[PDB]
Design a protein around this ligand. Structure first.
Ligand SMILES: C=C(C)[C@@H]1CC[C@@H](C)[C@@H]2CCC(C)=C[C@@H]21
Ligand SMILES: [Mg+2]
Length: 287
């Protein structure tokens, strides 16, 4: 597994920070002019995290079509993802409008609402079945149908209703709840198990719109999730599995949204997940 001897060589040489900086130097730099217009200042959670103009998701509405969200389209892998920031108190209606318009089936959330004693995300879904949420600026109603709480993650089933037309869709919410406050998980086993739960749900499949992935800024943990998924897909599809190069897949994803993978230990963790997940897809079905 070329990547696995690349992994051991980089650990041995203690050069993860140098590998990561080289990725930062060669990453694309495209314009983000819409994100920087003054009328959009309260739609952005972080001043240094914006969507490129060429890949941004446009809301289907006159007035203001802006949301901080990017379409990441992986041609060879045949997979698309929408990466977005954690919604703001005033962008929750835009978030669900984007989900409606893009025909997404799943939302993947990789942060908690409060981390390090600060609010990383608005409470954008209902916590109780009997208290639904109405987003009047976008004319959508959201209802909790059920939820399954497990040790490392929670899965919710929600109903999203277009109050204009009274159509309804079922949305699956996949909430990874135990990413540590500092660093990365020591073992990728629980992250891979989470990834495969999302895959089994159908939410990642071409009969649906792209899955919506977010953490707080939509680049760190979010980038790790998409990078691992796409790498494992390429290894399944290809005549030569060990031809998959993580660093070139990461740079290709960074053509669509800036800053994906935010630290050198996130880079290292991404290798770990792909190496370990590759065991579980080269014929070794056992668990
Ligand atoms: C996905 C994995 C590589 C691991 C295999 C071993 C288990 C302890 C762990 C938790 C239980 C499930 C179903 C698989 C996970
Ligand atoms: Mg460059």
């Amino acid at each position: 597994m070329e990547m696995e001897k690349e992994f051991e060589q980089i650990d041995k040489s203690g050069s993860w920070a140098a590998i990561y900086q080289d990725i930062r130097h060669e990453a694309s730099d495209f314009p983000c002019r819409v994100a920087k217009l003054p009328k959009n200042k309260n739609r952005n959670r972080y001043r240094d995290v914006s969507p490129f103009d060429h890949s941004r998701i446009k809301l289907h509405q006159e007035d203001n079509d802006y949301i901080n969200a990017s379409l990441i389209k992986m041609e060879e892998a045949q997979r698309s993802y929408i990466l977005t920031q954690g919604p703001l108190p005033n962008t929750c209606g835009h978030f669900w409008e984007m989900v409606w318009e893009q025909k997404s089936r799943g939302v993947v959330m990789l942060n908690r609402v409060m981390e390090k004693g600060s609010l990383k995300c608005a409470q954008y879904w209902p916590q109780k079945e009997e208290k639904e949420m109405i987003f009047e600026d976008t004319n959508l109603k959201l209802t909790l149908i059920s939820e399954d709480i497990k040790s490392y993650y929670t899965v919710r089933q929600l109903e999203l209703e277009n109050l204009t037309t009274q159509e309804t869709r079922e949305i699956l919410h996949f909430h990874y709840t135990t990413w540590p406050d500092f660093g990365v998980p020591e073992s990728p086993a629980s992250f891979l198990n989470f990834l495969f739960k999302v895959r089994e749900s159908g939410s990642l499949s071409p009969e649906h719109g792209p899955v919506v992935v977010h953490c707080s800024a939509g680049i760190g943990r979010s980038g790790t999730f998409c990078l691992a998924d796409t790498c494992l897909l390429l290894m399944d599809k290809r005549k030569d599995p060990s031809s998959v190069d993580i660093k070139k897949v990461l740079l290709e994803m960074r053509k669509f949204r800036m800053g994906l993978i935010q630290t050198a230990d996130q880079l290292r963790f991404s290798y770990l997940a792909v190496i370990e997940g590759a065991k579980f897809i080269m014929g070794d079905s056992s668990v």
